[PDB]
From a paper:
By combining microcrystal electron diffraction with native mass spectrometry (ED-MS), we develop an approach to rapidly and accurately determine structures of biosynthetic or clinically relevant ligands bound to enzymes. We demonstrate this approach with the model protein lysozyme bound to its noncovalent ligand N,N′,N″-triacetylchitotriose (ACT), then use the cysteine protease papain as a scaffold on which to bind a panel of both known and potential inhibitors, including the epoxide-based covalent cysteine protease inhibitor E-64 (27), its commercially available chemical analogs, and analogs generated by biosynthetic reaction. Last, we extend the ED-MS workflow to interrogate crystals of the β-lactamase enzyme, CTX-M-14, which imparts resistance to β-lactam-containing antibiotics by hydrolyzing their four-membered ring structural motif.
We next interrogated ligand interactions of the cysteine protease papain, as isolated from papaya latex. The assignment of this oxidation state is substantiated by its resistance to reduction with dithiothreitol (DTT) or tris(2-carboxyethyl)phospine (TCEP), unlike other +32 Da modifications such as persulfides, which would be reduced under these conditions.
Author numbering: 1 to 212
Write the structure that this text describes.
Amino acid sequence: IPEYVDWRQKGAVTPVKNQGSCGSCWAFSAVVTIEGIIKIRTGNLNEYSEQELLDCDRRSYGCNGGYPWSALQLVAQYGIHYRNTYPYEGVQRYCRSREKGPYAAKTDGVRQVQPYNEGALLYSIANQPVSVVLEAAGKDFQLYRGGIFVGPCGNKVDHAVAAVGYGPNYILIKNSWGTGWGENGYIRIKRGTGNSYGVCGLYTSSFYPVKN
């Protein structure tokens, strides 16, 4: 795999979103991997509905948090609508997939990256954007304004984001806190420290959709 990967330069990443007060990061995370894999397989970049996952993933807890892998299984099992037809409201409502007509896209499954393995994650990122989790509650992460983030942070992961790239000394993360946070909405997190958790627990739980 190359020294540098940036799925934004291959046009597989849509604009940075803001999840708002809602703890819907798990849905935003899952969506950017869906947006990535559909662009990689069909050449078409579309935005898909975080709100639909928010409303429809019964295993997750809406704005109280949830599981990227459950959201990803939902899209594998049923499908997902365009963001335009099912826009983000920042509040869990009822599942309205059936009122929105046919699904815009479907995936074929979900795989977990082998946990606590930096190489395994990098290999997956070289293939497609990956849903990863990290500890975002620390003030240093929240006040991140740019550069390669090394912490401080622990491993109490609490926030789902998407890895969309990497370089020799970092992994490139799309956050869902709007374009004003970090590097126009992104954070580069140090890799290669030999801590098997990853910086801020980044290697704890990583998932990507499969599309044949």
